[PDB]
Amino acid sequence: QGTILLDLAPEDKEYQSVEEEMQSTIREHRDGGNAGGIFNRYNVIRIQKVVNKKLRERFCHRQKEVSEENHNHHNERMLFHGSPFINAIIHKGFDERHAYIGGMFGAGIYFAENSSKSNQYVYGIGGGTGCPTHKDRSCYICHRQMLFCRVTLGKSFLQFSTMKMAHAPPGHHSVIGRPSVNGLAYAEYVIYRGEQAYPEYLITYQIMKPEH
Ligand SMILES: COc1ccccc1NC(=O)c1ccc(NC(=O)CCc2nc3ccccc3c(=O)[nH]2)cc1
Ligand SMILES: [Zn+2]
């Protein structure tokens, strides 16, 4: 009836694929790590596959609607997502009704191909006030969660400057905020429909305090 979480064996390719995509997309942000914390490695505590009959159906249906409107190419893409609402997402799915309105490209659901990018949002905008128990944005003790999702982009509208949107532009299904000299440091992917993203993997982890 609800969401089933399947544990993945660290000895299985799927677990391995996910972890590498998460560990190898770490990058230094102009932030100095104030939002997500100072680190260059994560300690993956566990990866669970999210299974929801209903979520999958709304996702797949949305998928061929998008196809009809894009030459039969849904343009699926694996992207990371970080927010203080993961437990709600894995059970009810993404919902644009609880979307970020204070964002670069409006009221959308944001994604990033860089795990360290979503990590800055796991505890709120700018990392908020940090983890729940120690109120520390760079804490290395608490378990953080993030998602590696299937995101249907269809025909994406590409833009450089910050123009607030409420839906995708006509003929499009997503907005990609592209890197600018005076703008973004890395790409962000936006969708204005929850059913365009499926929360495939639940990743529990800790950021790791550096070495030399
Ligand atoms: C209360 O929330 C819910 C309850 C039931 C079902 C769904 C939800 N909420 C959501 O789906 C949801 C969806 C999106 C957000 N917020 C965001 O997308 C912004 C946080 C964020 N921003 C980014 C910007 C650039 C690159 C990556 C990110 C990112 O990972 N997260 C917060 C909540
Ligand atoms: Zn903590």
From Swiss-Prot:
Residue ranges constituting the PARP catalytic domain according to the UniProt record: 9-211
Tissue-specific expression: Ubiquitous; highest levels in testis.
Compartments, record wording: Cytoplasm; Golgi apparatus membrane; Cytoplasm, Cytoskeleton, Microtubule organizing center, Centrosome; Nucleus, Nuclear pore complex
Binding residues annotated for Zn(2+), in chain numbering: 131, 134, 139, 142
UniProt superkingdom: Eukaryota
Changes after translation: Phosphorylated on serine residues by MAPK kinases upon insulin stimulation. Phosphorylated during mitosis. Ubiquitinated by RNF146 when auto-poly-ADP-ribosylated, leading to its degradation. Deubiquitinated by USP25; leading to stabilization.
Family label: Belongs to the ARTD/PARP family.
Functional summary from the UniProt entry: Poly-ADP-ribosyltransferase involved in various processes such as Wnt signaling pathway, telomere length and vesicle trafficking. Acts as an activator of the Wnt signaling pathway by mediating poly-ADP-ribosylation (PARsylation) of AXIN1 and AXIN2, 2 key components of the beta-catenin destruction complex: poly-ADP-ribosylated target proteins are recognized by RNF146, which mediates their ubiquitination and subsequent degradation. Also mediates PARsylation of BLZF1 and CASC3, followed by recruitment of RNF146 and subsequent ubiquitination.
Subunit structure comment from the entry: Oligomerizes and associates with TNKS2. Interacts with the cytoplasmic domain of LNPEP/Otase in SLC2A4/GLUT4-vesicles. Binds to the N-terminus of telomeric TERF1 via the ANK repeats. Found in a complex with POT1; TERF1 and TINF2. Interacts with AXIN1. Interacts with AXIN2. Interacts with BLZF1 and CASC3. Interacts with NUMA1.
Protein name: Poly [ADP-ribose] polymerase tankyrase-1
Protein species of origin: Homo sapiens (Human)
Phylogenetic placement of the source organism: Eukaryota, Metazoa, Chordata, Craniata, Vertebrata
Portion held of the full protein: 1104 to 1314 of 1327
